[PDB]
Design a protein around this ligand. Structure first.
Ligand SMILES: CC(=O)N[C@@H]1[C@@H](O)[C@H](O)[C@@H](CO)O[C@@H]1O
Ligand SMILES: [Cl-]
Ligand SMILES: [Cl-]
Ligand SMILES: [Cl-]
Ligand SMILES: [Cl-]
Ligand SMILES: [Mg+2]
Ligand SMILES: [Mg+2]
Length: 342
């Protein structure tokens, strides 16, 4: 099993993709809007991915709500976490988790890259993608994100807390290529790290961001720092689940490493499944070759975490049109609920 998630180009697995999947057996896949056109087409895509894999593959998506939604082509739209936080409706947060779980499960998706546990500390911090945050302090994020994650998981879809160690504090720095969190660890655990610690039982997994924590490691970002992952995340925070990386194919991280080396480095640091989201095929062979250069016991620990995740993955619902109509009906009603509450 290749320890990574890889993207898929289109509505069906291509020839080159299918070849690499048979040969390398990736732990799973991440889907985007380019993979989602109709219910039948999606269920066929996820069926293909499951059949091409000997193990039960992770099939993941960023179905957050608002401006991060991958199902527009299905007519399935969802409100943003920030809008449900403003609405103040507790039932609305439950329903976002429940409806997301129901729909993703009908499509054969088994993991959602949510909740976002970043804190939106100030309405001044500019965010290119607005609305992703559940609140402006750790306690509100824990309360709203926890209700979300609970009901996502209650519906059989695994959750992922992101982005460790807390993107709300990350600032651009002239002396660094990647964003920087200069906070002391003790203040981090009182604030941006607190949602990850408080919600561990509700988080199937956690995704690490490409952020510099220079007081802990001045040379490698969190995703590639053994001190941040094995020290801060595994030891002090105590998280025992699967650790994903931020995408290795886009962003400032690509100006520092190529995706195959970064994937290896993240496994060395203690992550379990780096994300190779866009054009993955050129990088998979170099990763699979460098794999046996890892400590065999570390590889065994990481495989047991991935195996535990895989064993919790749920299978798609049997075909039933009225079930999918309810997904559309409840999603539409959830959007109108937020719209009417403004
Ligand atoms: C900071 C940020 O937006 N990171 C995103 C993450 O949210 C997403 O889940 C992943 C897969 O699409 O790609 C990027 O790493
Ligand atoms: Cl292909
Ligand atoms: Cl919003
Ligand atoms: Cl806080
Ligand atoms: Cl844990
Ligand atoms: Mg369509
Ligand atoms: Mg299978």
């Amino acid at each position: 099993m290749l320890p990574a998630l890889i993207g898929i180009s289109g509505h069906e697995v291509g020839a080159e993709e299918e070849a690499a999947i048979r040969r390398l057996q990736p732990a799973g896949f991440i889907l985007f809007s380019r993979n989602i056109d109709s219910v039948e087409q999606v269920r066929g895509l996820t069926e293909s991915l499951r059949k091409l894999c000997l193990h039960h593959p992770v099939i993941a998506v960023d179905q957050e709500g608002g401006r991060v939604v991958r199902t527009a082509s299905l007519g399935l739209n969802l409100p943003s976490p920030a809008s449900l936080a403003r609405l103040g409706s507790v039932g609305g947060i439950v329903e976002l988790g429940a409806v997301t779980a129901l729909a993703l499960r009908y499509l054969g998706v088994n993991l959602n890259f949510a909740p976002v546990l970043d804190i939106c500390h100030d309405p001044s911090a500019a965010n290119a993608l607005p609305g992703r945050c559940w609140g402006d302090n750790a306690q509100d994020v824990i309360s709203r994100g926890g209700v979300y994650a609970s009901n996502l998981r209650r519906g059989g879809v695994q959750s992922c807390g992101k982005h460790f160690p807390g993107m709300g504090r990350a600032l651009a720095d002239p002396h660094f290529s990647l964003p920087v969190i200069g906070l002391d660890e003790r203040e981090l655990f009182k604030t941006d790290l607190l949602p990850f610690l408080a919600l561990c039982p509700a988080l199937s997994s956690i995704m690490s961001a490409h952020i510099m924590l220079p007081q802990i490691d001045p040379d490698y970002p969190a995703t590639l720092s053994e001190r941040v992952i094995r020290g801060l995340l595994r030891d002090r925070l105590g998280f025992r689940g699967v650790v994903f990386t931020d995408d290795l194919c886009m962003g400032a991280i690509t100006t520092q490493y190529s995706p195959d080396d970064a994937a290896f480095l993240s496994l060395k640091a203690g992550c379990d499944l780096p994300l190779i989201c866009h054009d993955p095929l050129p990088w998979l062979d170099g990763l699979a070759s460098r794999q046996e250069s890892l400590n065999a016991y570390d590889r065994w620990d990481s495989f047991k975490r991935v195996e535990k995740l895989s064993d919790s993955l749920c299978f798609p619902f049997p075909e039933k049109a009225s079930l999918w109509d309810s997904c559309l009906r409840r999603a539409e009603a959830l959007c109108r609920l937020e719209e009417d509450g403004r």
